[PDB]
Every structure is written in structure tokens, then in C-alpha cells.
Design an enzyme around this catalytic site. Structure first.
Site, PDB file in Angstrom:
ATOM      1  N   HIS A  60      -6.457  -1.622  -1.188  1.00  0.00           N
ATOM      2  CA  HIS A  60      -6.917  -0.258  -1.494  1.00  0.00           C
ATOM      3  C   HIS A  60      -8.118  -0.191  -2.453  1.00  0.00           C
ATOM      4  O   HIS A  60      -8.626   0.901  -2.712  1.00  0.00           O
ATOM      5  CB  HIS A  60      -5.798   0.674  -1.978  1.00  0.00           C
ATOM      6  CG  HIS A  60      -5.208   0.361  -3.331  1.00  0.00           C
ATOM      7  ND1 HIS A  60      -5.843   0.733  -4.506  1.00  0.00           N
ATOM      8  CD2 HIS A  60      -4.012  -0.181  -3.638  1.00  0.00           C
ATOM      9  CE1 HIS A  60      -5.022   0.383  -5.489  1.00  0.00           C
ATOM     10  NE2 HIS A  60      -3.908  -0.178  -5.017  1.00  0.00           N
ATOM     11  N   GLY A 107      -5.408   1.630 -13.370  1.00  0.00           N
ATOM     12  CA  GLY A 107      -6.231   0.459 -13.647  1.00  0.00           C
ATOM     13  C   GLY A 107      -5.450  -0.846 -13.659  1.00  0.00           C
ATOM     14  O   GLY A 107      -6.037  -1.927 -13.759  1.00  0.00           O
ATOM     15  N   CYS A 124      -3.534  -1.943 -11.086  1.00  0.00           N
ATOM     16  CA  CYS A 124      -3.327  -2.525  -9.752  1.00  0.00           C
ATOM     17  C   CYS A 124      -3.972  -3.882  -9.685  1.00  0.00           C
ATOM     18  O   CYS A 124      -5.000  -4.110 -10.323  1.00  0.00           O
ATOM     19  CB  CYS A 124      -3.840  -1.613  -8.651  1.00  0.00           C
ATOM     20  SG  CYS A 124      -3.139   0.041  -8.696  1.00  0.00           S
TER      21      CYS A 124
HETATM   22  O1  LIG Z   1      -0.354   4.784  -7.625  1.00  0.00           O
HETATM   23  C1  LIG Z   1      -1.529   4.505  -7.810  1.00  0.00           C
HETATM   24  C2  LIG Z   1      -2.697   4.792  -6.873  1.00  0.00           C
HETATM   25  C3  LIG Z   1      -2.282   4.715  -5.412  1.00  0.00           C
HETATM   26  C4  LIG Z   1      -2.016   5.870  -4.685  1.00  0.00           C
HETATM   27  C5  LIG Z   1      -1.564   5.793  -3.376  1.00  0.00           C
HETATM   28  C6  LIG Z   1      -1.359   4.558  -2.779  1.00  0.00           C
HETATM   29  C7  LIG Z   1      -1.625   3.417  -3.510  1.00  0.00           C
HETATM   30 CL1  LIG Z   1      -1.248   1.860  -2.823  1.00  0.00          CL
HETATM   31  C8  LIG Z   1      -2.109   3.477  -4.801  1.00  0.00           C
HETATM   32  C9  LIG Z   1      -3.727   3.724  -7.299  1.00  0.00           C
HETATM   33  C10 LIG Z   1      -3.470   3.565  -8.792  1.00  0.00           C
HETATM   34  N1  LIG Z   1      -2.033   3.862  -8.909  1.00  0.00           N
HETATM   35  C11 LIG Z   1      -1.282   3.513 -10.075  1.00  0.00           C
HETATM   36  C12 LIG Z   1      -0.591   2.307 -10.152  1.00  0.00           C
HETATM   37  N2  LIG Z   1       0.224   1.951 -11.158  1.00  0.00           N
HETATM   38  C13 LIG Z   1       0.383   2.817 -12.152  1.00  0.00           C
HETATM   39  C14 LIG Z   1      -0.255   4.082 -12.216  1.00  0.00           C
HETATM   40  C15 LIG Z   1      -0.036   5.009 -13.267  1.00  0.00           C
HETATM   41  C16 LIG Z   1      -0.659   6.224 -13.262  1.00  0.00           C
HETATM   42  C17 LIG Z   1      -1.523   6.573 -12.231  1.00  0.00           C
HETATM   43  C18 LIG Z   1      -1.759   5.710 -11.197  1.00  0.00           C
HETATM   44  C19 LIG Z   1      -1.130   4.438 -11.149  1.00  0.00           C
END
Ligand SMILES: O=C1[C@H](c2cccc(Cl)c2)CCN1c1cncc2ccccc12
Ligand SMILES: O=C1[C@H](c2cccc(Cl)c2)CCN1c1cncc2ccccc12
Ligand SMILES: [Cl-]
Ligand SMILES: [Cl-]
EC number: 3.4.19.12
Lengths: 305, 300
Positions: B41, B143, B145
């Protein structure tokens, strides 16, 4: 989201762990530049521990009595001196992995990461606080002496603890890197006990702010308290006194969540007097006190090293 | 003495963390030999996330669209390929700090250390378990990921998790290092939810044995149970079924303490019924399920 008991990345410290042997005794050493730091009790037999005269025991030893092993490479000891309860072994090779470092003496309530080691090899890393009774609730087996505690401030490793002993209640006692014990403890096989412990009030408040930041608000209330009324209630429940310095340190967390420090004190006062009523805070049925206000800000902001 | 939630020393993994940028998106990558592994992603905008056709988005990208930073040194991308939900960026330089490693896919109930990173830089290390609902209860901000989960048994780093997303309950979903998600999750901004979570029964039993090894016996009782009667009770408290495999795995701890697995199961049945009555077990007022039988033996 999420809140975990998080330790500093241990890589800079792992590159400093060495094995130190004196006779039949084997423990860990901290190799910084051309010096290896380790507990001075490494020179003792079990009989010597009963009542040691470290100056007299050390004068009988020579450099070749200390075997220092950095991985699979033997380091040669070219000098030895004692500073308080730590032995400093001058080695012939400077550690090429020596990070930017300082030796700092911490106050009770301050937290640090412990890199537990056996035979000069790191086995694990965990977070812990210096208890108000100067002990740490660590996880150490025989052979872990010489393991160190540290924090990281930007690129600088601040070494704050070296492991020396386990008290009969299973709690641990050790020194700063200048060999001064934390607490009224001595490096001798004699009757010693941890004093009655107290809860680190400023840390509990910091952890309550972390719970608010993470969406846990059930414990909040419409009330506020004076610092003096809160301190009478803190004394009652074996909680450390909350000072104006602590209130100032909690300022950033108070501004972020919009909950004044004395507003959060009335939440804690209510929790102490009534319990949790079957509820949890951040997955805990107890009020957690091993996160400082800085630990909470660092974790709820992602500071890196 | 003492029992702590202990993570593996993270040094071997820190020497692998790099920053990966694609357009406006910046996350972390794992640099092993001449390959950088990161969530696929990274090639998406927030708009692409609802229904991304990763194969179509990736074909439009060239090597110079991926900026890889290892400390203050920019690495040159010389190839790229996708394997499931992970992007593999072929880089021009092999990582000199590459440790002995393997990619392992873990089962729910397994534990691992997470080295949380932001901008290619490690910020902290904590211990985690793969929940029975295939999520992990991590501590991750935007940030993070590309941050990885691992175990370091006997000098070899076994990489088992790469962080990809946060679900609406605040729990985390990710993949093994071959890009296969743990759980029924997809790398899309569509409605997704963690299934109802359960307690890892074998882990709670392992932690009760750690408490016995550390001198705590208050929760022991004169009773035993059948495996089936234990599961009928445990199911009512949202505990995972205990299998014969789990009973076998607890054998060493049972022999060490002299307490039969089904006798320890009767203690757990009683704790579930009564709570702790103001007591604690290894400094905890709740039953801990994030130490495996293997972790207990390693630590005690
Ligand atoms: O969940 C996501 C976003 C996302 C959205 C849809 C699909 C995918 Cl695979 C990924 C990308 C970053 N992220 C986060 C990852 N971990 C912690 C987080 C905390 C607070 C905000 C975001 C966070
Ligand atoms: O407490 C001690 C011994 C000791 C005795 C008298 C004075 C001093 Cl400074 C040290 C040396 C090893 N050691 C241990 C250190 N940490 C954990 C342990 C666990 C189980 C057994 C021993 C352990
Ligand atoms: Cl003396
Ligand atoms: Cl036992």
C-alpha cells in the site's frame, strides 16, 4: 492506537555486552571504549561474600585472573581498578561499537530499559521503574549480574543501572555505572530487605492521561481537588506525594487531553477510595505506575532513535 | 526470580530498518541482503485505498519512483516485484548488517517482539501475541506500517509479522513476510472489523505454571477436571478450547512443578469463577495470556 510497556531499542547496548570470568565466577560486563565495567563481587567466592574486603581481595588478583570475552574473541586485560561497587577492567582493545554515552544516576519513579544478559549474551529486553524503595521489580536469574539499565536521549545512551543482586522477596538491587548502589544495600551475603514500597503517583497520573488519549474516559469526573487535599489522600493509600514539579511535568498531557492535572487527581482520588468497580483501564485491573509522563508523550508521539 | 513481559534484543532487526517513500507516502521497510520488503500500500494514495488494483498501480511505477533511505544513505532501487501484500524492492547494495534470518508464519497464541519504527528509525520494542482473532494489540501510530514482528531463538531472527493497518477498535492487522495477511483482512479502506476475541487458554495455563515456579500457590486447589468439562466451562468465559496438543506442550512445565495439566485446569476453572479476591498473580490482577509455554521455560 494501543499502549504497551515499551523498552528502548537495545542495539546500541547489545554491541557493549561482554562475558567476564574471575576464577569460577562468570557474569556480564559493559565494554565502553577500552574499559569493561562489571560488579566488583565477580572477584569473590561464596565464602568471601559473607564478609568481603574488596580492596584486599582485589590486590591478590592480577590482570590475567580476569578473562574477558567479546563474542568469540578474548580481550586482554591490561589494568584493573575499583570505583565504589564496580570493577573497571582496562582492556587492550577499544570497543568499535561504542555508542555516544553518558553515565546518569536516576531518581525513584524514573523508568529504564534492562537488557538482561547471561554469559555476555543478551537474552531479553524489558522496561521497569526504579521503585521508591530503590529496588527494581526485574526478571533476573543467576548469571545476570552485570546486566545494564539505560535510556536513550536522541543518539546518546544514558546508562543508569547495573545489576548486582536479588533480595529475598525476589526484587532486585544494583548500582549506577559509578558503582554507587541505589538504596541502602551492600554487596555482601548478609540479611538485607526491601523497605515498604509506595506507588509512583505522577506515573499513575501519566498512565491515566495515556488511557484518555486512547479513548478510555469512564474514570473522568466533574470534580477537581487542591494539591494539599490530594496529598492527604495519597499518603493514606501508600502513594508517593505529588509535588508542584510533578504537576508542571504533566502540563503537556493536561493541555493535549483538555483535563487539568488537579482534575485528573480527583479521578485518581475517586479510584483509590472506590476501586475500579469491575472495569479496566488500558487492559489493567490495577493502576499502573511504571510509565513516566515522558514515556507517555514519547509513545503517544512516536519519538525515534 | 521475577516475571516480566520480555522482548527479544532488537539490535539484529534495527540494523535492517529503512525508510521507503513512494510519492507522498512514507513508511518503513525491512532490508535483508539486497531486498527491501514493505507493505504494497506504499504505492497507493488515500483515494486508491478504497478499491486498489495494486497490479495496475504497480505497473505504472518505475524503480526511481521508490526512494529508499538507510540512515543518511540513499539506496538505489534496481527492480521491484509484488508477492501477495508485500512489495519487494531489489536494491543495488546488500545490507552488511543482515543477520541470520528466516521467514516464519505463526499460529494464533504465538508471541513475538515488535520493533515499532517511524521514518525508518526504531522508536521502541514490545512483546505481542497473535490474538485468536488474528489481530495483534499493538502500539502503532500513523507511519508505523512496515514495522516488523520477530523471535530470535538461537542467533537466528525469525521474521513473522509486518504491520499494515489499524482496525476501528484500535487493534492491528498485518502479514507474514511473504505478504499473506493473518486473518480475514485485506489491504483496502473497506469496512473491516476484528472478530470477537478470546483468551489464549494454553498461555494462561503456562503463566500459572510460571507463578508456581516463582513460589505462588494460593490459586491451586485439590480438584482436577476432564479435558471436555474444562472446555465446556472455559468456552463460557470466552476462552479458546484447550486441545490435547496444548496439554502435551504443557508437559515439561507440569513435570517441573509436579502439577498435572488437568489439575492446573481446575485452578483456572476456579479463578474464572471466583476472580482473585484482592490478590495478584505475578503482579497482575488479570489472568495474562501473552506468554507461551515456550516463553515461560525460556524466562524461568
Ligand atoms: O490503518 C492504516 C492505514 C490503512 C488503511 C486501510 C488499509 C490499510 Cl492496509 C492501511 C495506513 C496507515 N494505517 C495505520 C496503521 N497502524 C496504525 C495506525 C494508527 C493510526 C492511523 C493509522 C494507522
Ligand atoms: O543476588 C545474587 C548473589 C549475591 C549475593 C550477595 C551479594 C550480592 Cl551483591 C550478590 C550473586 C548472584 N545473585 C543473583 C542476582 N540476580 C538474580 C539472582 C537470582 C537467583 C539467584 C541469584 C541471583
Ligand atoms: Cl570492603
Ligand atoms: Cl517448582
Amino acid at each position: 492506537s494501543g499502549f504497551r510497556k515499551m523498552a528502548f531499542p537495545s542495539g546500541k547496548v547489545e554491541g557493549c555486552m561482554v562475558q567476564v570470568t574471575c576464577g569460577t565466577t562468570t557474569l556480564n560486563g559493559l565494554w565502553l571504549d577500552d574499559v569493561v565495567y562489571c560488579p566488583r563481587h565477580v572477584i569473590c567466592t561464596s565464602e568471601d561474600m559473607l564478609n568481603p574486603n574488596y580492596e584486599d581481595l582485589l590486590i591478590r588478583k592480577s590482570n590475567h585472573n580476569f578473562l574477558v570475552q567479546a563474542g568469540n574473541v578474548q580481550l586482554r586485560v591490561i589494568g584493573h581498578s575499583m570505583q565504589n561497587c564496580v570493577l573497571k577492567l582496562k582492556v587492550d582493545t577499544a570497543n568499535p561499537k561504542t555508542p555516544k554515552y553518558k553515565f546518569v544516576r536516576i531518581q525513584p519513579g524514573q523508568t529504564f530499559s534492562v537488557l538482561a544478559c547471561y554469559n555476555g549474551s543478551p537474552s531479553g529486553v524489558y522496561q521497569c521503574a526504579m521503585r521508591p524503595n530503590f529496588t527494581i521489580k526485574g526478571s533476573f536469574l543467576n548469571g545476570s549480574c552485570g546486566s545494564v539499565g539505560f535510556n536513550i536521549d536522541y543518539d546518546c545512551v544514558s546508562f543508569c543501572y547495573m545489576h548486582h543482586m536479588e533480595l529475598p522477596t525476589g526484587v532486585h538491587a544494583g548500582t549506577d555505572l559509578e558503582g554507587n548502589f541505589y538504596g541502602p544495600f551492600v554487596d555482601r551475603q548478609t540479611a538485607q530487605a526491601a523497605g515498604t514500597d509506595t506507588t509512583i503517583t505522577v506515573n499513575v497520573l501519566a498512565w491515566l492521561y495515556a488511557a484518555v488519549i486512547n479513548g478510555d474516559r469512564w474514570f473522568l469526573n466533574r470534580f477537581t481537588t487542591t494539591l494539599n487535599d490530594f496529598n492527604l489522600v495519597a499518603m493514606k493509600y501508600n502513594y508517593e506525594p505529588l509535588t508542584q514539579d510533578h504537576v508542571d511535568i504533566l502540563g503537556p498531557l493536561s493541555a493535549q487531553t483538555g483535563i487539568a492535572v488537579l482534575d485528573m487527581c480527583a479521578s485518581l482520588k475517586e479510584l483509590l477510595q472506590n476501586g475500579m468497580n469491575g472495569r479496566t483501564i488500558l487492559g489493567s485491573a490495577l493502576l499502573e505506575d511504571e510509565f513516566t509522563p515522558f514515556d507517555v508523550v514519547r509513545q503517544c508521539s512516536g519519538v525515534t532513535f
